[PDB]
Design an enzyme around this catalytic site. Structure first.
Site, PDB file in Angstrom:
ATOM      1  CG  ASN B   9       5.300  -3.507  -5.735  1.00 36.24           C
ATOM      2  OD1 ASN B   9       6.173  -2.665  -6.009  1.00 36.24           O
ATOM      3  ND2 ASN B   9       4.077  -3.164  -5.281  1.00 36.24           N
ATOM      4  CE  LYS B  11       3.929  -3.591  -1.419  1.00 37.43           C
ATOM      5  NZ  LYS B  11       3.023  -3.817  -0.241  1.00 37.43           N
ATOM      6  CG  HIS B  88      -0.154  -1.583  -5.377  1.00 37.30           C
ATOM      7  ND1 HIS B  88      -0.241  -1.221  -4.053  1.00 37.30           N
ATOM      8  CD2 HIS B  88       0.330  -2.845  -5.394  1.00 37.30           C
ATOM      9  CE1 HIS B  88       0.184  -2.217  -3.298  1.00 37.30           C
ATOM     10  NE2 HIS B  88       0.531  -3.218  -4.090  1.00 37.30           N
ATOM     11  CD  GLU B  90       1.294  -0.381  -0.654  1.00 34.52           C
ATOM     12  OE1 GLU B  90       2.098  -0.052  -1.549  1.00 34.52           O
ATOM     13  OE2 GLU B  90       1.576  -1.211   0.241  1.00 34.52           O
ATOM     14  CD  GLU B 160      -3.202  -4.661  -4.638  1.00 32.12           C
ATOM     15  OE1 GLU B 160      -2.440  -4.461  -3.656  1.00 32.12           O
ATOM     16  OE2 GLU B 160      -3.670  -3.734  -5.340  1.00 32.12           O
ATOM     17  N   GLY B 166      -3.725  -5.156   6.644  1.00 31.63           N
ATOM     18  CA  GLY B 166      -3.786  -4.176   7.720  1.00 31.63           C
ATOM     19  C   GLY B 166      -5.093  -4.091   8.477  1.00 31.63           C
ATOM     20  CB  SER B 206       0.284 -11.979   2.848  1.00 35.59           C
ATOM     21  OG  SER B 206       1.556 -12.294   3.396  1.00 35.59           O
TER      22      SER B 206
END
Ligand code: NA
Ligand code: NA
Lengths: 246, 246
Positions: B9, B11, B88, B90, B160, B166, B206
């Site tokens: 991905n 992004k 996703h 995000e 995910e 974060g 990750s």
């Protein structure tokens, strides 16, 4: 003397690259009359095709600009795309794109060398409440402080009568003129007459071959942000309505 | 035997078409070991370039699919793009893409001949509350009824660990395995063992050259949805970790 401006917004069209190529071939053969600045906005996937094949006297525009799924100024900037639409009613309403967000986006786009078609316009409730001027003025008043010194040459403002889009109400030619004048007057009041006199203010309601000439002649209407007709042969009629704008 | 699957991905990267072309040239020279299905997701503006230049043993994916500013299945379908990412983290978190919306989107994408990488995963609060399984199970339970009969061959699911993105918390290899197993078990409970045994379930936290081999070996981890490393030379190491997956 402001140069008439016509932006064609393809929105989420056409369906295929072959249809986009055929549309481009037709636009490339179109005989432009008068003096007019023309920009064509297209889906992201098609921008490379437009930038390569579209007549170089016209410019290509993004329909929007920005994580996963999103597209950015350097990418389009790096492709040689110089324009974007910002604040289009569909994005404001459907996706809750707000004014602080949008003025912030304009500031950022302009700071990065982008030219912008900045959209505004009121909904039915404010129109019916007699607050259309008030609502639109407020939108522009939020936009104004976001424009960097020296960047007003790179801003065009489009008035979308959202109150007349999908509501069962229609806008008159006089309605377009009045709201464009509202915009110009707020510019004059806040940033001065020199700026107000050079900024192109567009009508972004329903524009077709059968009303473009009448609309063009309106003194504060400097052009159009065209929806569906941008995909049709009459787009050239709309581009050429500039001859009716004094 | 499920074929290991690695999705890269990109992004909102890279910054320019020249950088995308150089990345493609590097991927085109990469020596793949083992048996692995590789898909590369890229910004819309770059998909034409990928579809034309990327090694044809790999497939191109949209990062998302859908009015002004939006992109649709026929356009990508008509370009020959067969994959999209959906849901996703995000897009879910930042843009409030909800489950009904997302399962609806999966149904629609699959009905139109698209293959999907359907993302799920819990946030820190649910992880800390001891509700991770419950939350993820619910997400998949909403997805399941949306999959048309005969379309499970065209679905991959990516876990995910949003709780570890974060937040100052990191996920262990065991955490990845456990949550992939949670997903497989819910598939088994709801739609049966034959479906559960063929669906690839990916780890989307990750993933780097330094942890891919360990993760690959996990029995319920069938591959990866890779973020930043997809832009780097170690993406090939991640693709080749399939040799460690039994
Ligand atoms: Na005029
Ligand atoms: Na494995």
């Amino acid at each position: 003397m402001r140069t008439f401006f016509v932006g064609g917004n393809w929105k989420a069209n056409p369906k295929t690259v072959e249809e986009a190529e055929k549309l481009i071939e037709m636009l490339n053969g179109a005989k432009v009359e008068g003096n007019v600045e023309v920009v064509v906005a297209a889906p992201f996937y098609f921008l490379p095709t437009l930038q390569q094949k579209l007549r170089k006297d016209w410019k290509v525009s993004a329909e929007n600009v920005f994580f996963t799924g999103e597209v950015t100024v350097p990418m389009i900037k790096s492709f040689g795309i110089e324009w974007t639409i910002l604040g289009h009613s569909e994005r404001r309403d459907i996706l809750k794109e707000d004014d602080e967000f949008l003025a912030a986006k304009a500031k950022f786009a302009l700071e990065n060398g982008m030219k912008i078609i900045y959209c505004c316009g009121e909904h039915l409730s404010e129109r019916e409440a007699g607050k259309a001027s008030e609502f639109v003025s407020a939108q522009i008043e939020k936009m104004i402080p976001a424009i960097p010194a020296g960047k007003w040459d790179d801003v065009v403002i489009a008035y979308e009568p959202i109150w007349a889009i999908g509501t069962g109400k229609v806008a008159s030619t006089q309605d377009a003129q009045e709201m464009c004048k509202v915009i110009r007057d707020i510019l004059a009041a806040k940033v001065g007459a020199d700026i107000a006199n050079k900024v192109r203010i567009l009508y972004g309601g329903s524009v077709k071959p059968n009303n473009c000439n009448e609309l063009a002649a309106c003194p504060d209407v400097d052009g159009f942000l065209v929806g569906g007709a941008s995909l049709e042969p009459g787009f050239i009629n709309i581009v050429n309505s500039n001859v009716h704008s004094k």
